[PDB]
């Protein structure tokens, strides 16, 4: 039932119910010859929605908003981007066009600027050192340390025990580390442990790319990082 690269053309988006008031969004994108899939999150708060990550580009993010408005029928009022790469901030200008208040960590804004990528407008201050946590509407935003990138954050929804691990967590089938050009492989194991120790009751763990699983995904990531 979970969408993969094989059932979504580039330029379409799909939503998938994870629990009460929680969906993942799934999109696709081609770099050169390779097509990938990518996951974000949608969390209901009263009569509004908080978006976690873009759908990897402006065309995908417009379609994300259209799918959200079809399937759910509530406005996206704020967004959070979980690191600086295009699959997280790519399409932030689409969000701003639509009146969305876009947030990320200060480091993510600096790194995104340095990479020539779109930059969320507002900083989540108080997310500066490994271990920092802030509450944000219906979720916690946790900065566990460097791993996939120096700035990567995870988002936990406590009501329903859902952890969006983003690109710091690999899916079950993935056996290679991936894009490690911004990675901190030395620190990635300690970062994962901080996540495991913080969210031991998580029922679902969603990676940045691929299929969701449980908490087994965290140690699987430590194994893949070697």
Q: Does 87 bind Zn ion (CB under 5 A)?
A: yes
Please identify, among the stretches 60-68, 83-91, 99-107, 207-215, the one whose residues bind Mg ion according to the rule CB under 5 A: 83-91
The answer to the question of whether 25 is labelled as a binding residue is: no
- Other beta carbons less than 10 A from residue 132's beta carbon: 17
21: partner contacted, choices Mg ion, Zn ion, none (Cβ within 5-8 A by kind): none
85: partner contacted, choices Mg ion, Zn ion, none (Cβ within 5-8 A by kind): Zn ion
How far is 49 from 71, CA to CA, in rounded Å?
13
Q: What's the min distance (Å) between Cβ of 121 and Mg ion?
A: 18
Say if residues 154 and 161 touch (Cβ distance below 8 Å). no
Query: What does the DSSP assignment read for 42-102?
Result: EEEETTEEEEES--SSHHHHHHHHHHHHHHT-S-EEEEE-SSSSHHHHTTHHHHHHTT-EE
- Other beta carbons less than 10 A from residue 131's beta carbon: 10
- From the candidates 87, 117, 151, 170, give the one annotated as an active-site residue: 87
Residue 110 is given by DSSP the state H
Say if residues 8 and 179 touch (Cβ distance below 8 Å). no
Which member of 45, 86, 93, 140 binds Mg ion (CB under 5 A)?
A: 86
Backbone region of residue 39 per phi and psi (left: phi > 0; alpha: psi in -120 to 50; beta: other values): beta
86: partner contacted, choices Zn ion, Mg ion, none (Cβ within 5-8 A by kind): Mg ion
- CA atoms in the 13 A half-sphere facing the CB of 12: 9
The answer to the question of whether 83 is labelled as a binding residue is: yes
Check if 83 is active-site: yes
Q: What's the min distance (Å) between Cβ of 63 and Zn ion?
A: 18
Check if 151 is active-site: no
Q: Which of residues 165-194 bind Zn ion (CB under 5 A)?
A: 167
Which member of 25, 85, 170, 194 binds Zn ion (CB under 5 A)?
A: 85
87: partner contacted, choices Mg ion, Zn ion, none (Cβ within 5-8 A by kind): Zn ion
Q: What's the min distance (Å) between Cβ of 113 and Mg ion?
A: 11
Check if 148 is active-site: yes
Residues at the interface with Mg ion (CB under 5 A)? 86, 117
Kindly list the catalytic residues.
83, 85, 87, 148, 179
């Amino acid at each position: 039932e979970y969408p993969t690269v094989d059932d979504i053309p580039v330029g379409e988006v799909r939503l998938y119910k994870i629990g009460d008031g929680v969906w993942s969004h799934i999109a696709t994108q081609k770099l050169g010859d390779t097509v990938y899939s990518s996951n974000g999150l949608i969390v209901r708060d009263a009569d509004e929605l908080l978006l976690i990550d873009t759908a990897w580009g402006a065309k995908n993010t417009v379609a994300l908003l259209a799918e959200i408005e079809k399937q759910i029928g509530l406005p996206v009022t704020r967004s959070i981007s979980t690191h600086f790469h295009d699959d997280r901030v790519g399409g932030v200008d689409v969000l701003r066009a639509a009146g969305v208040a876009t947030y990320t960590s200060p480091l993510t804004r600096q790194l995104a600027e340095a990479a020539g990528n779109e930059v969320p407008a507002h900083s989540l201050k108080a997310l500066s050192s490994s271990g920092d946590v802030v509450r944000f509407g219906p979720v916690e935003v946790f900065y566990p340390g460097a791993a996939h990138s120096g700035d990567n954050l995870v988002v936990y929804v406590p009501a329903v025990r859902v952890l969006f691990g983003g690109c710091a967590v690999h899916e079950a089938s993935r056996e290679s580390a991936g894009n490690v050009a911004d990675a901190n492989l030395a620190e990635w194991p300690a970062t994962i442990k901080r996540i495991q120790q913080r969210y031991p009751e998580a029922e679902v763990v969603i990676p940045g790319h691929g299929l969701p699983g449980g908490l087994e995904l965290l140690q699987h990531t430590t194994n893949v990082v070697k």
